[PDB]
Ligand binder design. Structure first.
Ligand SMILES: C=C[C@@]1(C)CC(=O)[C@]2(O)[C@@]3(C)[C@@H](O)CCC(C)(C)[C@@H]3[C@H](O)[C@H](OC(C)=O)[C@@]2(C)O1
Ligand SMILES: C=C[C@@]1(C)CC(=O)[C@]2(O)[C@@]3(C)[C@@H](O)CCC(C)(C)[C@@H]3[C@H](O)[C@H](OC(C)=O)[C@@]2(C)O1
Lengths: 176, 177
C-alpha cells in the first residue's frame, strides 16, 4: 500500500545506448531467428556489468537495461561521482570494442549523462521494478536519445562540473 | 543465456503518453513524489486485473516508465486458437477502464495509447548484474511500434493481427473496437 521512495540530490544518471543494434538484429537461418543476436547482446551487457566489480566503479549502480540501452548511476549512496560516471561510460566503450573485434561487428555507444536530484522507488504490485524517476533522469535520457554515436552528450550544467574535474567538453557539450 | 521460444504470443505496449507532461517537481507537487504515487496507483491497479480469472493467461513482462508491457501466449507447457489475441484486447480495454476510475478520483484526464501485435517471440534473461527477463523479437518491436505510432485512447494493430481480430469479432478500421 506504501510507495517505496527515497529522494537523493545530485546523482549522476547515464543512458548508454547502442542505437545500431535494432538494425543488426535479424531473425533468419544464419541467426537462428534472433537467438544469435540476443546472445551477442547478452554478451555485451554481461561484459558491461563486469565493470561494476571494478573497485574503480564501486560507486556505480546499474539500475537496469531497456532493450540494449544501459542505465546506471553514481550518487545513490559533489562532482567526483559525476566524473566517475564519465569514466564508466568510457569503460563501456572499451568493452564494446573488445566485443566488436571478437564478433566482427562495429557497434557504437551513444551515451547521455546528467546529474541532479532524483527519486528512486519501486512501482507496481506484480513484478516490482526499482527505477530512478525525475527530471534529471528524463534529461539524462534526452542527452542519450539526442546524442551522437561514440560520444557522451552532457548538459550545460554538468559540463561545467566536469571541467571543474578535468574533462575538456566540446561545445551540445560532448566528451571523450 | 537462458531463453525459451514461443510462437504466436500477443504482446501489448499500453502507454500513457500525456503523463510526461503532467509530471512536475514543485511545492504543490512534492518535487515529483505526488506524481510517482499516482503512477504507482495507476500501475498497481492495472496489475490487479491480472488476478482476474478472465485474464489468468495475461502475463506482465514489465513497465517502462509509465508504459505497461503484457502478453498472452507465453504459457509454457509444450503445446506447439487465436483466442489469446482477443484476450489481449479485452485486457487493454480493462486498462482503460481502470485509468478512467483513476482520472475521476484524482481529477485527471489521462489517456491510454495501446499497441498490440502477435507472433513468434524469444523470452529470455539478459545481464549478470540485475538480470532481467523479456520478450525479444520483431513481433515485439512491432507491438511497440504500434504503440509509439498509435493514437490516444485507441488500440493500433497491424494488418495481420487485425484479421485474426475480425475472425474473433472485433470491428477493425484503418484500430480495434
Ligand atoms: C515518470 C516520469 C517521467 C516524466 C520522468 C522519468 O523519470 C521517466 O520515468 C524515465 C526517464 C526514468 O524513469 C528512467 C527510465 C525511462 C524508461 C528512461 C523513463 C521514461 O523515459 C519515462 O517516460 C515515459 C513516457 O515513461 C520518464 C521520462 O517519465
Ligand atoms: C534487442 C533487440 C531489439 C532489436 C528487439 C527487441 O525485442 C527490443 O529489445 C524490445 C522491442 C523488446 O525487448 C521489448 C522491450 C522494448 C523496450 C520495447 C525493447 C526495445 O524497443 C529494444 O530496442 C532498443 C533500441 O533497445 C528492441 C526493439 O531491441
Amino acid at each position: 500500500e506504501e510507495l517505496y521512495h527515497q529522494s537523493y540530490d545530485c546523482v549522476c544518471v547515464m543512458f548508454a545506448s547502442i542505437p545500431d543494434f535494432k538494425e543488426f538484429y535479424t531473425e533468419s537461418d544464419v541467426n537462428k531467428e534472433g537467438l544469435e543476436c540476443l546472445r551477442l547482446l547478452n554478451e555485451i551487457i554481461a561484459d558491461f556489468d563486469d565493470l561494476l566489480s571494478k573497485p574503480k566503479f564501486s560507486g556505480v549502480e546499474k539500475i537496469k537495461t531497456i532493450g540494449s540501452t544501459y542505465m546506471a548511476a553514481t550518487g545513490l549512496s559533489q562532482y567526483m561521482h559525476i566524473g566517475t560516471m564519465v569514466e564508466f561510460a568510457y569503460a563501456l566503450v572499451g568493452k564494446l570494442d573488445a566485443i566488436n573485434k571478437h564478433s566482427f561487428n562495429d557497434f557504437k555507444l551513444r551515451v547521455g549523462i546528467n546529474h541532479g536530484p532524483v527519486i528512486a522507488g519501486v512501482i507496481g504490485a506484480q513484478k516490482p521494478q526499482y527505477d530512478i524517476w525525475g527530471n534529471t533522469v528524463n534529461v539524462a535520457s534526452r542527452m542519450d536519445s539526442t546524442g551522437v554515436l561514440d560520444k557522451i552528450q552532457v548538459t550545460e550544467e554538468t559540463s561545467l562540473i566536469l571541467q571543474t574535474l578535468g574533462y575538456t567538453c566540446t561545445c551540445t557539450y560532448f566528451v571523450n
